Amino acid sequence: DLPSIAISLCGGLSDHREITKDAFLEQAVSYQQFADNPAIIDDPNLVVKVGNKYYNWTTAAPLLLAMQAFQKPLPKATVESIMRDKMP
Amino acid sequence: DLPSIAISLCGGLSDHREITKDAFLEQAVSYQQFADNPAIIDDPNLVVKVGNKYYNWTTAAPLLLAMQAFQKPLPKATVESIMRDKMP
């Protein structure tokens, strides 16, 4: 019931570029890849796809914590506020 | 099937103290509390309980990202490695 999550190293947020599905998919991070290098989570090019939206880690973090701690997403208005504070 | 997650502002990790269940529960963070102040995620006293273990946010982050991106936890040996790198 929760929105799906996927991660990629395609980058493109800090420079404010329009991210393509195929670019995201081409650099998707696998479980084995992440387990072998958990520091991927600190890579500035990490993009987190939540449902149909692309976020950086700093914005995705509170969204993902709320989903797993409370089994429901944050309110849309809260997400928009977090984006204003933590998205590039 | 995934381990349960809960969050609290009880603190006690950076000073290396032995955290009590009741202290964690007394300062548990609610959904409304987190939605009203998502910056709680940056509070140094934030403790993340994953299953039966207490982590700080920097350690919990890759564990929670892997659970939601891959629908399974990281290997125990990987978690132990992350703890050595990111736990206080």
Author numbering:
A (entry chain A), B (entry chain A): 461 to 548
Give sentences copied directly from the paper behind this entry.
Lipins are magnesium-dependent phosphatidic acid phosphatases (PAPs) that catalyze the dephosphorylation of the membrane lipid phosphatidic acid (PA) to produce diacylglycerol (DAG). Our principal findings are that the M-Lip domain is a new protein fold that forms a dimer, binds membranes, and can affect lipin PAP activity, oligomerization, subcellular localization, and adipogenesis. Phospholipid synthesis and fat storage as triglycerides are regulated by lipin phosphatidic acid phosphatases (PAPs), whose enzymatic PAP function requires association with cellular membranes.
We, therefore, truncated the M-Lip domain of mouse lipin 1 to remove the C-terminal cluster of hydrophobic and basic residues implicated in membrane binding by HDX-MS. We refer to this construct as the M-Lipxtal domain. The M-Lipxtal domain could be purified without detergent and was extremely stable with a melting temperature of 65 °C. The structure of the M-Lipxtal domain of mouse lipin 1 was determined to resolutions of 1.5 Å and 1.9 Å in two unique space groups. Phases were obtained using single-wavelength anomalous diffraction from selenomethionine (SeMet)-derivatized protein. The structure of the M-Lipxtal domain revealed a protein fold with a three-stranded anti-parallel β-sheet at the core. Flanking the β-sheet were a set of two alpha helices (α1 and α2) and a short 3–10 helix (η1) that were oriented perpendicular to the β-sheet and two C-terminal α-helices (α3 and α4) that were oriented parallel to the β-sheet. Thus, the M-Lip domain represents a previously unrecognized and novel protein fold. Two additional peptides present in the crystallized M-Lipxtal domain were also protected. These peptides mapped to the same surface, which suggests that the core of the M-Lipxtal domain can also interact with membranes but is not the major determinant of membrane binding.
